[PDB]
Every structure is written in structure tokens, then in C-alpha cells.
Amino acid sequence: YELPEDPRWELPRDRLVLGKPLGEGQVVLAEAIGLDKDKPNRVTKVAVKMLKSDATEKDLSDLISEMEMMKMIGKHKNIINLLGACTQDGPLYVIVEYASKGNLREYLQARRPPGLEYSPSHNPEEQLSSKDLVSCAYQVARGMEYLASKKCIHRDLAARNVLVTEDNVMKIADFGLIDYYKKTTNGRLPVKWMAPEALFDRIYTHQSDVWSFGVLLWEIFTLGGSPYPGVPVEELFKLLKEGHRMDKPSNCTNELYMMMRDCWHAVPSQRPTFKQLVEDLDRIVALTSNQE
Numbered sequence: 658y659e660l661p662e663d664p665r666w667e668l669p670r671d672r673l674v675l676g677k678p679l680g681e682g683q684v685v686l687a688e689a690i691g692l693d694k695d696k697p698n699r700v701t702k703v704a705v706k707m708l709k710s711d712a713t714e715k716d717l718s719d720l721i722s723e724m725e726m727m728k729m730i731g732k733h734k735n736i737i738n739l740l741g742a743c744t745q746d747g748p749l750y751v752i753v754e755y756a757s758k759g760n761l762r763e764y765l766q767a768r769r770p771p772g773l774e775y776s777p778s779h780n781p782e783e784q785l786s787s788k789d790l791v792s793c794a795y796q797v798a799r800g801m802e803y804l805a806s807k808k809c810i811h812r813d814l815a816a817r818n819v820l821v822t823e824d825n826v827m828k829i830a831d832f833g834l835i836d837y838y839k840k841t842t843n844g845r846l847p848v849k850w851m852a853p854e855a856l857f858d859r860i861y862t863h864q865s866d867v868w869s870f871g872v873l874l875w876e877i878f879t880l881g882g883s884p885y886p887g888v889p890v891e892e893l894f895k896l897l898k899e900g901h902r903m904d905k906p907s908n909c910t911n912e913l914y915m916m917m918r919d920c921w922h923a924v925p926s927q928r929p930t931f932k933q934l935v936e937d938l939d940r941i942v943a944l945t946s947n948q949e
């Protein structure tokens with residue numbers, strides 16, 4: 658309730674115009690007036706995180722901790738950035754950048770090629786080239802390399818946790834933040850993104866996020882495909898113990914599949930780092946056709 662004031666980040670409440678809910682604590686779309694010192698007269702569309710009415714002191718401490726972590730990490734183009742907070746005289750609001758094109762999974766699926774008689778009415782007004790897909794991978798690797806340089810371990814890197822802005826910029830999110838059988842809102846199992854050592858030994862490192870990044874690359878090249886569809890938790894454990902790896906998606910180069918497979922090295926020390934992935938993806942982007 659009574660939080661201390663951080664003038665670096667404090668935005669007066671009368672400057673924030675709460676709008677439609679974006680997700681559910683809970684996230685709402687809002688308009689911030691004079692978020693920056695100049696101009697005090699410009700409105701910026703923002704996303705506001707707040708607690709729900711049924712929240713406890715632990716939920717408040719979690720929101721505070723998340724806001725505190727975002728302050729420490731600092732700004733990067735490929736992460737959802739903290740813009741402000743309302744901590745005084747009312748509920749805590751954590752104001753962050755708004756990504757109008759939703760999560761990367763939704764973004765990719767909406768840009769899938771048009772429906773056919775064997776699918777047949779998916780008629781997108783939006784389409785992605787091969788260069789655009791490698792660009793998404795590069796931007797996510799860049800956000801992750803930055804987070805890694807700030808000693809941050811994501812633990813849930815997946816296309817659902819990557820947001821897309823109006824300018825098509827990839828931004829890593831978290832929803833700064835376990836039941837293996839718990840499914841996402843979309844009905845998918847997060848264990849399908851977890852490195853075996855994180856899954857079986859609860860060892861979380863940058864190497865285990867690199868494993869998750871390999872699953873994220875697979876999600877990109879299948880245009881929002883669902884990893885291991887119809888595979889329950891127990892069968893997934895068995896696939897990992899057998900050293901099973903997902904097949905190469907169609908419209909994926911041998912080079913990019915080799916990258917996915919490298920991210921999925923059984924030995925964590927042998928996986929590429931985010932620094933190596935950013936360099937390889939930088940070179941690959943430049944050589945990838947935008948003609949198809």
C-alpha cells in the first residue's frame with residue numbers, strides 16, 4: 658500500500674488514462690500524458706500492469722520485485738522497457754512499452770500463407786519474407802544477448818514471451834518475473850521449451866535459455882507452430898531422455914536447422930552463446946533473400 662517514491666520513474670496518476678484490458682495480475686492499454694520531461698503535452702500509448710482485486714501481499718511483492726528488476730536491467734531496443742510507475746496514493750501501476758501487434762506466436766500465425774481447400778478462408782493482408790523471419794530471430798537473439806550481459810536468465814523464453822510493436826520490433830517480455838502439467842492460455846505446455854538440465858536438474862543458466870531460443874527459432878520457421886503437438890509431459894520426458902530432436906521445418910535452410918540443433922546440444926557448455934548467435938544471425942540476415 659505505502660511504497661517509497663522513486664522520482665526517476667514516478668508518473669502522476671492524473672497523467673495516465675486507463676483503457677481496454679490487454680491480458681490477465683492484469684495488463685491494460687493506457688495513454689500517458691507527458692511521460693517524457695519534454696513534451697509534457699504528447700500522449701504515448703503504454704501497457705499498464707497492476708494487481709487484480711483478489712491479490713495478496715505476495716502478489717504485491719512480486720510486482721514490486723519485477724519493477725525493481727526492470728530498473729536494474731536498463732534499456733534495450735529488443736526488450737519491453739519500463740517507462741514509469743504510479744506507486745503513491747493508490748494501486749501500484751508498472752508502466753511499460755506497448756506492443757500493438759501482440760506476441761510473436763500470434764504475429765507469425767496471422768501472417769501464415771492463405772488458406773487452401775485442404776486447410777480455407779485465412780486471407781492475410783500481411784506477409785513475411787525469409788529475410789524477415791531471420792530478422793525476427795536476430796532481434797530476439799540481440800535482446801537475449803543484452804539480458805545475458807545484465808546477468809539476467811529468462812527461464813521462459815518462447816514466442817509467447819516476445820512482443821511485436823507497430824514498427825515490427827521484437828521485444829522480449831516476461832509472463833523480470835513449478836507445475837509441469839500446467840498449460841498456457843493457448844493450451845500449450847511450457848516444459849516443451851525447457852532445457853533437459855532445467856527440466857530434470859532445475860539448473861537454469863544462459864545455456865538453458867539458448868536451448869529455449871532453439872525452440873523459439875523452430876517456432877519462427879514454422880510460423881507459430883506448436884512444439885510436440887499431442888505429446889503429454891511424461892512422453893516429452895521420454896523423448897528428451899532418448900535424445901530426440903524436432904525435425905527440420907520446411908522453408909528452413911540447413912544452416913538455420915544446424916543452428917537450432919546446436920542450441921539443442923545435450924551438453925550445455927557446447928551450445929552456442931547468445932553473443933555467437935547474434936553474430937551468426939547478423940551474417941545470415943545479410944545473405945538471406947527478401948525476394949521470397
Ligand SMILES: Cc1ccc(C(=O)Nc2ccc(CN3CCN(C)CC3)c(C(F)(F)F)c2)cc1C#Cc1cnc2cccnn12
Pocket residue numbers: 679680684704705706723726727730736737751753754755756757759760804809810811812813820829830831832833834
Ligand atoms: C505490463 C507489463 C509488465 C511487465 C512486462 C515485462 O515484460 N516484464 C519483465 C519482467 C522480467 C523480465 C526478466 N526476468 C524474466 C524472468 N527471470 C526468472 C528473471 C528475469 C523481463 C525481460 F524482458 F527482461 F525479460 C520483463 C511486460 C508487460 C507488458 C506488456 C505489453 C505491451 N504491449 C502488449 C500487448 C499485448 C500484451 N501485453 N503487452
